[PDB]
Structure formats: C-alpha cells, structure tokens
Amino acid sequence: LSSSYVSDFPNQGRLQRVMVQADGDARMQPADILNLTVPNSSGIAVPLSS
Amino acid sequence: MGTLKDGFGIAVVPPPILELGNGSGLSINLQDRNNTGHTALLAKRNELIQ
C-alpha cells in the first residue's frame, strides 16, 4: 500500500506518470497486515502473524 | 542561381546588430494550445500564409 512509481507514458504531448497500487478495500483495515503473506522463495504462504 | 543547380543558396550581408532587426522584422510563431498534432498546425500555417 506504498504506491510505487514505475515509469512514464505520453499523453496529449506531455509525459505523465504511471502509479501502481492496491485497490480500495485491501488497505482499509490493519487486518490486511495480519495475513500479509511472503513468497518464501518456494511457494509456501508463511503468514506474517508468526 | 546560374551554375549551381542545387538548393537555393542565398547570400546576404549580415546586419551589424541582430537584435535590432533589418527594417521590417515581423516574426510570427503559430502555437498549438490543445496539442492537435503537427499536420494541423502546418495546415493552419499554410492558411495564414495564403
């Protein structure tokens, strides 16, 4: 939910930015931090609560 | 103009101070405030020339 800036793109003769973020309902409660999984370099979920 | 069948190649005596012009110094800069492209601006420049 940190709103990383990727690159630029042309629009109407100017160069505007492209911003990638999550949607609305995924960053409203702190419970999303509770089940925020990690890739674990193998595919196992490994939730953040442990 | 005689023995140089090529581009036009004009020869002119330069003015001593360029910022003061040479008599008539009308310079027009046709802009495009909506970014409609380049061919439309060239068509408007040709219409203004005509």
PDB file of C-alpha atoms in Angstrom:
ATOM      1  CA  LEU A   1       0.000   0.000   0.000  1.00  0.00           C
ATOM      2  CA  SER A   2       3.008   2.275  -0.563  1.00  0.00           C
ATOM      3  CA  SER A   3       2.084   3.496  -4.113  1.00  0.00           C
ATOM      4  CA  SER A   4       5.281   2.758  -6.015  1.00  0.00           C
ATOM      5  CA  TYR A   5       6.098   4.822  -9.117  1.00  0.00           C
ATOM      6  CA  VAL A   6       7.031   2.685 -12.122  1.00  0.00           C
ATOM      7  CA  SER A   7       7.595   4.769 -15.259  1.00  0.00           C
ATOM      8  CA  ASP A   8       6.182   7.453 -17.563  1.00  0.00           C
ATOM      9  CA  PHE A   9       3.869   7.426 -20.576  1.00  0.00           C
ATOM     10  CA  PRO A  10       2.950  10.001 -23.241  1.00  0.00           C
ATOM     11  CA  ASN A  11      -0.417  11.745 -23.041  1.00  0.00           C
ATOM     12  CA  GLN A  12      -1.568  14.831 -25.005  1.00  0.00           C
ATOM     13  CA  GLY A  13       2.006  15.683 -25.967  1.00  0.00           C
ATOM     14  CA  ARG A  14       3.311  15.531 -22.382  1.00  0.00           C
ATOM     15  CA  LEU A  15       4.942  12.813 -20.274  1.00  0.00           C
ATOM     16  CA  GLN A  16       2.781  11.769 -17.323  1.00  0.00           C
ATOM     17  CA  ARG A  17       3.483   9.198 -14.619  1.00  0.00           C
ATOM     18  CA  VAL A  18       2.192   5.665 -14.038  1.00  0.00           C
ATOM     19  CA  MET A  19       1.386   4.688 -10.443  1.00  0.00           C
ATOM     20  CA  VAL A  20       0.601   1.110  -9.375  1.00  0.00           C
ATOM     21  CA  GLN A  21      -1.197   0.489  -6.078  1.00  0.00           C
ATOM     22  CA  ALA A  22      -3.665  -1.873  -4.461  1.00  0.00           C
ATOM     23  CA  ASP A  23      -7.413  -1.268  -4.637  1.00  0.00           C
ATOM     24  CA  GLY A  24      -9.608   0.365  -2.007  1.00  0.00           C
ATOM     25  CA  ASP A  25     -10.778  -2.480   0.232  1.00  0.00           C
ATOM     26  CA  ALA A  26      -7.299  -4.024   0.662  1.00  0.00           C
ATOM     27  CA  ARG A  27      -5.809  -1.088   2.596  1.00  0.00           C
ATOM     28  CA  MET A  28      -8.670  -0.032   4.912  1.00  0.00           C
ATOM     29  CA  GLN A  29      -8.082  -2.206   7.997  1.00  0.00           C
ATOM     30  CA  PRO A  30      -4.849  -3.316   9.728  1.00  0.00           C
ATOM     31  CA  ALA A  31      -6.029  -6.954   9.422  1.00  0.00           C
ATOM     32  CA  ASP A  32      -4.504  -6.996   5.919  1.00  0.00           C
ATOM     33  CA  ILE A  33      -1.166  -6.678   7.732  1.00  0.00           C
ATOM     34  CA  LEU A  34      -2.166  -9.773   9.747  1.00  0.00           C
ATOM     35  CA  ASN A  35      -2.495 -12.110   6.740  1.00  0.00           C
ATOM     36  CA  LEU A  36       0.163 -10.443   4.552  1.00  0.00           C
ATOM     37  CA  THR A  37       1.937 -13.456   3.075  1.00  0.00           C
ATOM     38  CA  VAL A  38       5.514 -13.752   1.802  1.00  0.00           C
ATOM     39  CA  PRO A  39       6.691 -15.656  -1.319  1.00  0.00           C
ATOM     40  CA  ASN A  40       9.215 -17.686   0.800  1.00  0.00           C
ATOM     41  CA  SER A  41      11.177 -18.492  -2.455  1.00  0.00           C
ATOM     42  CA  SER A  42       9.362 -21.865  -2.706  1.00  0.00           C
ATOM     43  CA  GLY A  43       5.654 -21.035  -2.838  1.00  0.00           C
ATOM     44  CA  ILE A  44       4.654 -21.564   0.792  1.00  0.00           C
ATOM     45  CA  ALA A  45       2.400 -18.834   2.216  1.00  0.00           C
ATOM     46  CA  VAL A  46       4.027 -18.301   5.678  1.00  0.00           C
ATOM     47  CA  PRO A  47       1.664 -15.656   7.153  1.00  0.00           C
ATOM     48  CA  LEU A  48       3.084 -12.628   8.938  1.00  0.00           C
ATOM     49  CA  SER A  49       1.404 -13.416  12.279  1.00  0.00           C
ATOM     50  CA  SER A  50       4.124 -15.956  13.146  1.00  0.00           C
TER      51      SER A  50
ATOM     52  CA  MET B   1      21.436  30.976 -59.497  1.00  0.00           C
ATOM     53  CA  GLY B   2      23.257  30.348 -62.779  1.00  0.00           C
ATOM     54  CA  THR B   3      25.679  27.434 -62.384  1.00  0.00           C
ATOM     55  CA  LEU B   4      24.556  25.861 -59.083  1.00  0.00           C
ATOM     56  CA  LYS B   5      21.533  23.644 -59.854  1.00  0.00           C
ATOM     57  CA  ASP B   6      21.051  22.655 -56.219  1.00  0.00           C
ATOM     58  CA  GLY B   7      19.373  24.168 -53.199  1.00  0.00           C
ATOM     59  CA  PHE B   8      18.761  27.893 -53.448  1.00  0.00           C
ATOM     60  CA  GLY B   9      21.843  29.071 -51.508  1.00  0.00           C
ATOM     61  CA  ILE B  10      21.115  32.716 -50.733  1.00  0.00           C
ATOM     62  CA  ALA B  11      23.932  35.168 -49.995  1.00  0.00           C
ATOM     63  CA  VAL B  12      23.188  38.127 -47.730  1.00  0.00           C
ATOM     64  CA  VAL B  13      25.137  40.841 -45.915  1.00  0.00           C
ATOM     65  CA  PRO B  14      24.600  40.340 -42.165  1.00  0.00           C
ATOM     66  CA  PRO B  15      23.279  43.199 -40.029  1.00  0.00           C
ATOM     67  CA  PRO B  16      25.752  44.700 -37.539  1.00  0.00           C
ATOM     68  CA  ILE B  17      23.379  44.104 -34.597  1.00  0.00           C
ATOM     69  CA  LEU B  18      20.976  41.182 -34.979  1.00  0.00           C
ATOM     70  CA  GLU B  19      18.718  42.201 -32.071  1.00  0.00           C
ATOM     71  CA  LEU B  20      17.724  45.461 -33.800  1.00  0.00           C
ATOM     72  CA  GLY B  21      16.318  43.837 -36.953  1.00  0.00           C
ATOM     73  CA  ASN B  22      16.556  44.956 -40.581  1.00  0.00           C
ATOM     74  CA  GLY B  23      13.653  47.316 -41.249  1.00  0.00           C
ATOM     75  CA  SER B  24      10.623  45.028 -41.252  1.00  0.00           C
ATOM     76  CA  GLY B  25      11.143  42.456 -38.507  1.00  0.00           C
ATOM     77  CA  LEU B  26       7.758  40.760 -38.206  1.00  0.00           C
ATOM     78  CA  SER B  27       8.210  37.220 -36.857  1.00  0.00           C
ATOM     79  CA  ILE B  28       5.143  35.044 -36.245  1.00  0.00           C
ATOM     80  CA  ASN B  29       5.119  31.941 -34.026  1.00  0.00           C
ATOM     81  CA  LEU B  30       1.914  29.955 -34.538  1.00  0.00           C
ATOM     82  CA  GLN B  31       1.326  27.828 -31.431  1.00  0.00           C
ATOM     83  CA  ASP B  32      -0.998  24.915 -30.650  1.00  0.00           C
ATOM     84  CA  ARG B  33      -2.625  25.174 -27.212  1.00  0.00           C
ATOM     85  CA  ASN B  34      -4.539  21.872 -27.491  1.00  0.00           C
ATOM     86  CA  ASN B  35      -1.789  19.576 -28.929  1.00  0.00           C
ATOM     87  CA  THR B  36      -3.736  18.669 -32.065  1.00  0.00           C
ATOM     88  CA  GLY B  37      -0.624  17.379 -33.864  1.00  0.00           C
ATOM     89  CA  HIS B  38       1.785  18.697 -36.474  1.00  0.00           C
ATOM     90  CA  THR B  39      -0.115  18.419 -39.775  1.00  0.00           C
ATOM     91  CA  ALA B  40      -2.997  20.565 -38.494  1.00  0.00           C
ATOM     92  CA  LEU B  41      -0.536  23.251 -37.376  1.00  0.00           C
ATOM     93  CA  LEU B  42       1.137  23.110 -40.800  1.00  0.00           C
ATOM     94  CA  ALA B  43      -2.284  23.450 -42.454  1.00  0.00           C
ATOM     95  CA  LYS B  44      -3.082  26.466 -40.262  1.00  0.00           C
ATOM     96  CA  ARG B  45       0.317  27.974 -41.114  1.00  0.00           C
ATOM     97  CA  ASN B  46      -0.371  27.476 -44.839  1.00  0.00           C
ATOM     98  CA  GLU B  47      -3.816  29.059 -44.395  1.00  0.00           C
ATOM     99  CA  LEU B  48      -2.238  32.022 -42.585  1.00  0.00           C
ATOM    100  CA  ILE B  49       0.354  32.331 -45.381  1.00  0.00           C
ATOM    101  CA  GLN B  50      -2.414  32.322 -48.013  1.00  0.00           C
TER     102      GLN B  50
END
